[PDB]
Write a protein that binds this DNA or RNA. Structure first.
Ligand code: K
Ligand code: MG
Ligand code: MG
Ligand code: MG
Ligand code: MG
Ligand code: MG
Ligand code: MG
Ligand code: MG
Ligand code: MG
Ligand code: MG
Ligand code: MG
Ligand code: MG
Ligand code: MG
Ligand code: MG
Ligand code: MG
Ligand code: MG
Ligand code: MG
Ligand code: MG
Ligand code: MG
Ligand code: MG
Ligand code: MG
Ligand code: MG
Ligand code: MG
Ligand code: MG
Ligand code: MG
Ligand code: MG
Ligand code: MG
Ligand code: MG
Ligand code: MG
Ligand code: MG
Ligand code: MG
Ligand code: MG
Ligand code: ZN
Lengths: 231, 176, 122, 37, 73
RNA sequence: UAAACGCUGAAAGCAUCUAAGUGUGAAACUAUCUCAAAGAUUAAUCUUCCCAUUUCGCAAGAAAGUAAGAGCCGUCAAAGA
RNA sequence: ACCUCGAUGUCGACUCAUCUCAUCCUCGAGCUGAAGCAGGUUCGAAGGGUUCGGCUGUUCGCCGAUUAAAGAGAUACGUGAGUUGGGUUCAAACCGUCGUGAGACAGGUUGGUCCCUAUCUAUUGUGCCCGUAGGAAGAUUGAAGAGUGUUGCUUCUAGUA
RNA sequence: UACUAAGUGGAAAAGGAUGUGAAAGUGCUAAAACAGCAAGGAUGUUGGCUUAGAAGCAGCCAUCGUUUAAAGAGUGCGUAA
């Protein structure tokens, strides 16, 4: 469908009080003006997408093939390159900011790389149960769980593919859907998104139109303090 | 038998163009198009005011087709010349229907409003709120409209409530 | 968060000094009961001049919690003891008075009689 | 509808047909619809 | 009435497609699998099934090979 | 599409959901949602950058002789045994 | 009585579950001795879910309070190179009973050692080498796949049919 | 040269079915066949015991006769009947 996308860097999390008396936790995203580096058409390519360039850097910090591509396409040198599917309607070499893409309070989804956690066990990874601690116990306390499917020639006699055991956890792309944009800051190029965004502070973040609610925009307005300085 | 049944038609306004697999019938009303499936085991002949369908063999499907398409030609000619009509008696305590533009809307007993789109070539009229008349030139299409209107409220056996067919009797039950 | 087999106090006039939780009513494996939740209980410490007798299984609604809960504006309400009052099918209190303060989460889940018979709502 | 290994007419109005390669019994009385013949 | 079956190494990964679905969605794969099934289990059968270029349309990017035309083969 | 209900219709002048044709229909099935994926050896597509020497003979030949890039090493942590 | 007595660890519980449908709930439909509500039976359907406690080693079972439901089975009556050892079944001791006796009882009771550093394969993760036919740096399509899929209450419709 | 339409072949019983082919007989039919359609489809009477009542359609006493083309103490539904 008509999917709109922007790229930014998560800077932290705060809260804002809103009218209708709710305290909304928010995530703050620093969104640089993104530059459309390429447009790929359905007829000529067999699919349609828009590839932008963001996180600009000096020319001495870029490799020779990438800087050659940037100077051939007449673009600002940037070290980050990525595309979104089904993004159409933007001319090549046009600066795009989230203000032109999304509305004040529309629903969007956010994709980001999860915080790395390393080699984790079965319980921390698959929400498994821990074995009993008292009344007598054994060496394996944080046991993964018996992986027996069948013992004997008439049964599996093997661990089934895709078993739930210990392994790498974190540093993986994850998407959280139906997050309402709260506010735009043109001067600071700063987007406010309700809820919690995955990834460490300073990581890359992709804001896309929500596929569950594409056109739904739920109103949200902030509260103006009525206080007065001392009388 | 239907296959060896005369189809005497007057040449006043009804003509029947017989192509390879596209039979066209034109008359007082709109034109009806019939598709002939490939390798049809039955040849038509077009004399003066008389069409006769003959077959080549004694196959089971041959006999079935010979009867079926004689009936189809009869139905097409009748609909082209005089059309088909169906009558629905929508009866109940607060049941009523009416026609707005191309959509027929009904309010039987449902919180959500009920609307229904009318296909091309069929005209549905509502003289009285409890009465519906579906007039068309193709029997199967008017029948489909009648049954899809009926599906909203099938006649229950305990009382008379429902979208009944005309001169249609239902078995009565006494729910004390 | 009052849970299964939790002893709590009754804040009404009914003769029941200590009451024990039996089931967190409402669904399957409902782990906890927060403010405004209804539970099935058994009277364990009672008095001679009381409407209820020791051992009866009854239905109650919780009004206070030591753990507390957080509202939408961000205020965290926290009492110092878990308390419940005995209610009837109609959601009407069994006692004629309510002792101490009660939460406002009752207001959301009906329980208008409980609020009107309380000393002060919080 | 009654699913039985053997289907036979109950009244004189019950009529046996073969639909979708399955023999069924249809009749005016809906108590007598049978299948899986 | 006739089904084509493909099982992944997981449990429940048995995908079934009817003859009509195969004839519409992927017909090239159906012909490829049918030809492969008629070959001996071998290390040369891999190359043999490789030399079969099956296309779903009249067009083909293989006109540079100047392939002769024969019917019903 | 299953169960079920059909409209038009003969074999079997009636009837008939079916044989041709045309529908409706479930948390089941195929997609829509999330993730990973060209070692998919059937190894795919697009963009950019760098190679394009002198001699001898033997050419996906030799002696030297030509760049993009990558690695070793060091400081590290959005990562991590 | 065919495999195993140059050893295939046997009940129950815990952890992890997977599969089948003869379906407990949710989903669709036919009949009803179906007015409505709530039911009964049959057909289709295995995607998900299918509770906590008291007594007993218990499976089972009875009882209590909930739930939409508290399904039937298989997988060495799944699972001790994963845990426990309450039970059975070592040596100790007593009761009832049998025996003249030493002793014995699917009669009862108290107590009583559960080993192994993973080679292959299977699986969860993460790498080196090489191939993809010049090399390298980027961005992609997606053949074959994996993951999730549960449901309740209140209000309105409407005290309307 | 025939048969099967079930992937039967390529596993199964008691039982059920206008699947289809072959054969051997028998009834009617262009003095009109079968189905369907259009008409009539009776009288004593609603017979009588019997049953609160049955009287074309409760059990009976049985299971009438005429007119007439045909008609039944009825074919069911159904009516206290
Ligand atoms: K042995
Ligand atoms: Mg030990
Ligand atoms: Mg320990
Ligand atoms: Mg074997
Ligand atoms: Mg095996
Ligand atoms: Mg019909
Ligand atoms: Mg459909
Ligand atoms: Mg090779
Ligand atoms: Mg022997
Ligand atoms: Mg053995
Ligand atoms: Mg051995
Ligand atoms: Mg051993
Ligand atoms: Mg062992
Ligand atoms: Mg079943
Ligand atoms: Mg699905
Ligand atoms: Mg105790
Ligand atoms: Mg067994
Ligand atoms: Mg076992
Ligand atoms: Mg078991
Ligand atoms: Mg046994
Ligand atoms: Mg084991
Ligand atoms: Mg064990
Ligand atoms: Mg051990
Ligand atoms: Mg072992
Ligand atoms: Mg022991
Ligand atoms: Mg011990
Ligand atoms: Mg002893
Ligand atoms: Mg003695
Ligand atoms: Mg593979
Ligand atoms: Mg077979
Ligand atoms: Mg038969
Ligand atoms: Mg025969
Ligand atoms: Zn019948």
């Amino acid at each position: 469908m008509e999917i709109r996308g922007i790229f930014g860097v998560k800077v932290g999390m705060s809260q804002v009080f809103t009218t209708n008396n709710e305290r909304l936790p928010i995530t703050v995203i620093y969104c640089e003006p993104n530059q459309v580096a390429g447009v790929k058409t359905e007829a000529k390519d067999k699919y349609s997408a828009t590839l932008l360039s963001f996180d600009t850097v000096e020319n001495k910090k870029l490799n020779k093939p990438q800087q050659g591509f940037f100077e051939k396409n007449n673009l600002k040198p940037t070290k980050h390159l990525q595309e979104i599917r089904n993004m159409t309607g933007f001319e090549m070499g046009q600066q795009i900011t989230p203000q032109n893409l999304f509305q004040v309070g529309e629903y969007v989804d956010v994709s980001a790389i999860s915080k790395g956690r390393g080699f984790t066990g079965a319980i921390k990874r698959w929400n498994f149960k821990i074995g009993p601690l008292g009344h007598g116990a054994g060496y394996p306390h944080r046991f993964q769980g018996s992986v027996q499917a069948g013992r004997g020639g008439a049964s599996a006699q093997r661990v089934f593919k895709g078993k739930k055991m210990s392994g790498h956890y974190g540093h993986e792309k994850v998407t959280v859907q139906n997050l309402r944009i709260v506010g735009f800051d043109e001067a600071n190029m700063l987007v406010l998104v309700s809820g919690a965004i995955a990834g460490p502070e300073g990581g890359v973040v992709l804001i896309r139109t929500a596929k569950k609610k594409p056109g739904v925009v739920k109103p949200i307005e902030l509260a103006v303090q009525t206080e007065k300085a001392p009388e | 038998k239907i296959g060896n049944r005369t189809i005497t038609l007057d040449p006043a306004k009804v003509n029947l163009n017989f192509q390879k697999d596209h039979i066209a019938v034109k008359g007082p009303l709109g034109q009806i198009e019939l598709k002939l499936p490939p390798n049809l085991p039955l040849k038509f002949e077009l004399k003066d005011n008389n069409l006769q369908i003959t077959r080549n063999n004694e196959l089971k499907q041959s006999k079935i087709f010979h009867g079926t398409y004689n009936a189809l030609i009869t139905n097409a000619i009748i609909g082209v010349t005089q059309g088909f009509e169906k009558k629905l008696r929508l009866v109940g305590v607060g049941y009523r229907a009416n026609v707005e533009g191309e959509t027929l809307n009904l309010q039987l007993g449902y919180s959500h409003p009920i609307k229904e789109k009318i296909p091309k070539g069929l005209t549905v009229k509502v003289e009285k709120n409890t009465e519906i008349t579906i007039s068309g030139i193709s029997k199967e299409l008017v029948g489909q409209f009648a049954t899809e209107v009926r599906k909203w409220r099938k006649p229950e056996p305990y009382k008379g409530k429902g979208v009944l067919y005309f001169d249609e009797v239902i078995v009565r039950k006494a729910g004390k | 968060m009052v849970s299964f087999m939790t002893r709590l106090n009754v804040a009404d006039n009914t003769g029941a000094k200590q009451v024990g939780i039996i089931k967190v009513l409402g669904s399957t494996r409902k782990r906890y009961a927060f403010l405004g939740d209804v539970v099935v209980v058994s009277v364990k410490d009672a008095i001679p001049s009381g409407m209820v007798k020791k051992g009866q299984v009854l239905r109650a609604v919780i009004v206070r919690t030591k753990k507390g809960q957080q509202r939408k504006d961000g205020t965290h309400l926290k009492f110092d003891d878990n308390a419940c009052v005995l209610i009837k099918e109609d959601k009407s209190p069994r006692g004629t008075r309510i002792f101490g303060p009660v939460a406002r989460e009752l207001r959301e889940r009906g329980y208008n009689k409980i609020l009107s018979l309380a000393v002060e709502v919080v | 509808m009654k699913v039985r290994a053997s289907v036979k007419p109950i009244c004189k109005d019950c009529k046996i047909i073969k639909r979708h390669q399955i023999v069924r019994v249809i009749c005016k009385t809906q108590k007598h619809k049978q299948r899986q013949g | 009435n006739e089904f084509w079956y493909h099982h992944s190494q997981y449990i429940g990964g048995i995908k079934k497609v009817s003859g009509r679905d195969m004839l519409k969605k992927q017909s090239d794969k159906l012909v490829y699998n049918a030809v492969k099934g008629m070959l001996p289990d071998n290390r040369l059968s891999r190359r043999w099934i490789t030399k079969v270029h099956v296309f779903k349309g009249d067009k083909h990017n293989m006109e540079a090979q100047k392939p002769t035309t024969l019917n019903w083969s």
